[PDB]
């Protein structure tokens, strides 16, 4: 598709056998979700946003389905205002910005 | 340009007669710069994100060049970590997600 941005570019993602939705976000380095069904251990990771820094849960090599593709990437679980797919996963689906 | 996402998508902006650079941010509804010098009246706004809420000045109907292209729009001004171009401006320059 060619997604315009007259609205949030939200796509559907399948992670841990739950359908979630998240915003294709070119201004985030990483993928960050609020709650996900991921059973295993994770590592402590600090991220930066606009108001300060949050500590998040880093799960590596997670199998995830975004808009029709099965992808493997790092997925972070943190206090994000909305679910967000970052460049780590957008690159893997070949997503570019055009203008 | 077709811009890949292996690195931050940063572009030249031209605001208040200053060449600056800013991050095309599809996960931002609004546009936010570090402190710059603008004519016009401002009204205060609180904007949210990772790390919580920040108080900014909202300037209306501001002229600005993004990668050479002049567009007019609401520009927020505040103690952002980095210059951010939001969906409000990106829609004016014809910017789309592609995959």
């Amino acid at each position: 598709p060619q997604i315009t941005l007259w609205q949030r570019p939200i796509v559907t993602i399948k992670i841990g056998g739950q359908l979630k939705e998240a915003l294709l976000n070119t201004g985030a380095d990483d993928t960050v979700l609020e709650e996900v069904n991921l059973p295993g251990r994770w590592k402590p990771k600090l991220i930066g946003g606009i108001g300060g820094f949050v500590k998040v849960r880093q799960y590596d090599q997670v199998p995830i389905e975004i808009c029709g593709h099965k992808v493997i990437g790092t997925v972070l679980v943190g206090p994000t205002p909305t679910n967000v797919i970052g460049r780590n996963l957008m690159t893997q689906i070949g997503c570019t910005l055009n203008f | 340009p077709q811009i890949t996402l292996w690195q931050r998508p940063i572009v030249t902006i031209k605001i208040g007669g200053q060449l600056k650079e800013a991050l095309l941010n599809t996960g931002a509804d609004d546009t936010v710069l570090e402190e710059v010098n603008l004519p016009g009246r401002w009204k205060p706004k609180l904007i949210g994100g990772i790390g919580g809420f920040v108080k900014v000045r909202q300037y209306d109907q501001v002229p600005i060049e993004i990668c050479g292209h002049k567009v007019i729009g609401t520009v927020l001004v505040g103690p952002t970590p980095t210059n951010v171009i939001g969906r409000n401006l990106m829609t004016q320059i014809g910017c789309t997600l592609n995959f």
Binding site: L23, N25, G27, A28, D29, D30, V32, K45, L46, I47, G48, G49, I50, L76, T80, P81, T82, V84, G86 | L23, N25, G27, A28, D29, D30, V32, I47, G48, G49, I50, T80, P81, T82, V84, G86
Partner: peptide
């Protein structure tokens, strides 16, 4: 919302 994220 301004979902700028650095990691």
């Amino acid at each position: 919302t301004i979902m700028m994220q650095r990691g």
